[PDB]
Write a protein that binds this ligand. Structure first.
Ligand SMILES: Nc1c(O)cccc1C(=O)O
Ligand SMILES: Nc1c(O)cccc1C(=O)O
Ligand SMILES: [Fe+2]
Ligand SMILES: [Fe+2]
Ligand SMILES: [Fe+2]
Ligand SMILES: [Fe+2]
Lengths: 174, 174
């Protein structure tokens, strides 16, 4: 069977889900229960967490512009996703997507992580660059499981306290 | 490291590889040595073989129109990939892509099959619909390993002979 339905027009689908491609929802997964996790991500959205994905992530910035804050070679770096750009992110490269533009739309493709293969979410100290806090999660339902993880970081000065220099991470906003 | 390079503009990449998005090459893989196998497929091309992929395949028909001949519920079916369509194909649905238009371009995303997970390529009898021939292959390098597989089918009346009704499959062209 065509478990995931027939082909359909993607620009019209994006237009039809505009109300979800902005705060507070931000993103919408295209198909459910599939191995390929296919998501369209809108904006605006900024975030301070870095994702440590044990598998690859594919990006195609269909509308508008965004960028990824990265750690590369032990250094803070930025990869621009200009409108029309595609990009393949290797496993475990720490990344923090920033999406300043309303009306933007990025196709993201990931694969389901098998049982035992954990994702990491972590925060870094703006003063000295040391890792402040990391949580590992079996990421089955990100839409609903990530918000409480992030909220528990924002809520705890202990979690936000840099172990190296003592500076308390600002939490939700840079 | 950014093992697969920086982001880059996809429409310009497609324009720059136009000479490969037509016979005899037909398609071009975007990144090498990655888990996500990302390919742009042009045209024109018609084929008689059906692919049995043990994993999912994602399609986004960026330019022009194409279609997939399928077997669904034990019946010959067609899924149109009109310009702008996206589509997620479930594992093992037999499919035979047909790409009649020059200048067409389809983004296809697959994942590397691990050792021991085999692909199938097979042909069906136009007279009675019975399976005529199947080859299983550890698909590490399709660009170079599929042509000899297909050629060995076209070259052998035995391989092309329907076991049910005796009709000899036409081979390369329907
Ligand atoms: N990369 C993302 C993902 O995998 C899910 C939702 C959003 C994003 C993003 O790039 O913002
Ligand atoms: N689906 C395809 C693939 O995986 C590789 C090359 C071509 C195609 C196609 O759809 O024609
Ligand atoms: Fe990610
Ligand atoms: Fe610090
Ligand atoms: Fe295929
Ligand atoms: Fe037959």
């Amino acid at each position: 069977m065509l478990t995931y339905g027939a082909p359909f027009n993607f620009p019209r689908w994006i237009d039809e889900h505009a109300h979800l491609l902005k705060p507070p929802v931000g993103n919408r997964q295209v198909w459910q229960d599939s191995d390929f996790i296919v998501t369209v991500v809108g904006g605006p959205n900024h975030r301070t967490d870095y994702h440590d994905d044990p598998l690859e992530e594919f990006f195609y910035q269909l509308r508008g512009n965004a960028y990824l804050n990265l750690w590369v070679d032990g250094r803070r770096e930025r990869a621009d996703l200009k409108e029309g750009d595609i990009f393949l992110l290797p496993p475990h490269v720490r990344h923090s997507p920033q999406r300043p533009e309303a009306g933007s739309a990025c196709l993201v493709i990931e694969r389901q992580r098998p049982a035992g293969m954990l994702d990491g979410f972590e925060w870094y100290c703006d003063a000295c660059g040391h890792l402040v806090h990391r949580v590992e999660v079996q990421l089955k339902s990100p839409v609903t499981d990530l918000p409480p993880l992030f909220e528990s970081f924002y809520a705890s000065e202990d979690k936000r306290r840099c172990p190296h220099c003592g500076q308390v991470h600002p939490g939700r906003a840079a």
